[PDB]
């Protein structure tokens, strides 16, 4: 893997967690 | 490690230059890193100079030349034989390859 794509996957995980929190905030 | 103290670009004090496109592959490459070759040639080669001379009005018509500065890519330059890999002690030399003909 490249650091770029690991960072992007982390960002997508943050996407899912942020939408989950926003639905339950 | 530094393979090139000049970094290849030949910039040394600008920060940014405007890129130019490759003639073959259209690669947006900085104008100083890009390899520029001035193709000045004859609009009719020696294969047809005699034929044109015999079959042309305006006796002793000075035939025109054609000029084009080619901005090659660098992958293209390696591949299209324009520039060649060199010995590590030979990379030092920047003079052109010694006047192909005198």
């Amino acid at each position: 893997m490249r650091a770029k794509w690991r960072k992007k996957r982390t960002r997508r995980l943050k996407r899912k967690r942020r939408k989950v929190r926003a639905r339950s905030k | 490690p530094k393979k090139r103290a000049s970094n290849g670009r030949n910039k040394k004090g600008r920060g940014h230059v405007k890129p130019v496109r490759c003639v073959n592959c259209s690669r947006s490459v900085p104008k100083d890193k890009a390899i520029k070759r001035m193709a000045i040639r004859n609009i009719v080669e020696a294969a047809a100079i005699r034929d044109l001379s015999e079959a042309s009005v305006y006796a002793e018509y000075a035939l025109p030349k054609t000029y084009n500065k080619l901005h090659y890519c660098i992958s293209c330059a390696i591949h299209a034989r324009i520039v060649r890999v060199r010995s590590r002690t030979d990379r030092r030399i920047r003079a052109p390859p010694q006047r192909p003909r005198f």
């Binding site: - | 496109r21 259209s26 609009i43």
Partner: protein, 129 residues
């Protein structure tokens, strides 16, 4: 002048399917447009020198039937934002035009070269092949 009825050869040689297109001095009247792909089979050798050779023989014959005996070569590359270097076939086309009896005068290169391109096709990293 000994009444050499003049035309302009006006060759256009891209990297595929070169053009031989003779016209009068004004250029508003077009005669003998026959191209490279007009006469060769493979569809890949439209740019080949033989293509332009046969096209040149046809335009020479047609113009000779017309009455035009001398031509003015206007070599054009694909021009514009493109490679703008002359195609392989155009030189053979010019040679065959000069072979077939026609007289030659004032070769010019009239490729459209820009003060800059709008944008060159291919993306920032270009054609990867």
């Amino acid at each position: 002048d000994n009444s050499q009825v003049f035309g302009v050869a006006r060759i256009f040689a891209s990297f595929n399917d070169t053009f031989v297109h003779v016209t009068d001095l004004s250029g508003r009247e077009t005669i003998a447009r026959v191209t490279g792909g007009m006469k060769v089979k493979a569809d890949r050798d439209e740019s080949s020198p033989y293509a332009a050779m046969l096209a040149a023989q046809d335009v020479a014959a047609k113009c000779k039937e017309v009455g035009i005996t001398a031509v003015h070569i206007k070599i054009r590359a694909t021009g514009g934002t493109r490679s703008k270097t002359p195609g392989p076939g155009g030189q053979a086309a010019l040679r065959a035009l000069a072979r077939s009896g026609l007289r030659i005068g004032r070769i010019e290169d009239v490729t459209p070269v820009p003060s800059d391109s709008t944008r060159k096709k291919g993306g920032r990293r270009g054609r990867r092949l």
